[PDB]
């Protein structure tokens, strides 16, 4: 794969969202970090690629956000320790890296996770994520100039 090597390939935005997802799992306890735990924090955070795509395609960001929170509520609780990465998140991490690397990128942004999730809609279980799965990666590839113009996932200068 491998798990630790994939994480260092994440950009600042996605890494912060996963850290915040890990913090939440630790408090909710919450055995593993699922893509939904991460997607929740990605939306929660900013005007990231998902927020920009959400706007230009008009997604009920409230419903998605609400749907995610409701799913995370039906997540088995055990002991408030420190969490593992779910098989679904581990697989998403590998597919998103495959999407990012092929595009000549150095880091994985939320649109690469969306590109991975688009050809792998089974990695997510939460029903309210269907607007995220309406896009194709040929489409998301074309939308790159728009994403650099409005998203916090912005490289520098």
């Amino acid at each position: 794969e491998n798990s630790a090597a994939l994480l260092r390939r994440l950009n600042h935005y996605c890494a912060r969202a996963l850290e915040g997802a890990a913090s939440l799992c630790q408090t909710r306890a919450h055995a593993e970090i699922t893509p939904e735990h991460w997607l929740l924090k990605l939306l929660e955070q900013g005007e990231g690629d998902l927020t920009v795509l959400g706007r230009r395609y008009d997604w009920d960001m409230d419903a998605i956000w609400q749907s995610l929170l409701g799913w995370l509520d039906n997540q088995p609780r055990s002991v408030r320790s420190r969490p593992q990465l779910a098989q679904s998140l581990n697989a998403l991490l590998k597919q998103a890296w495959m999407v990012a690397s092929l595009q000549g990128e150095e880091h994985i942004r939320s649109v690469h996770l969306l590109g991975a999730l688009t050809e792998n809609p089974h990695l997510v279980r939460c029903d309210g994520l269907w607007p995220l799965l309406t896009l194709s990666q040929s489409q998301l590839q074309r939308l790159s100039p728009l994403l650099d113009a409005q998203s916090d996932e912005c490289p520098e200068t």
Partner: peptide
Amino acid sequence: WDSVYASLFEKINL
């Protein structure tokens, strides 16, 4: 070698 990648790593690889 980010100050922030380490903070993420703090959490459970197994």
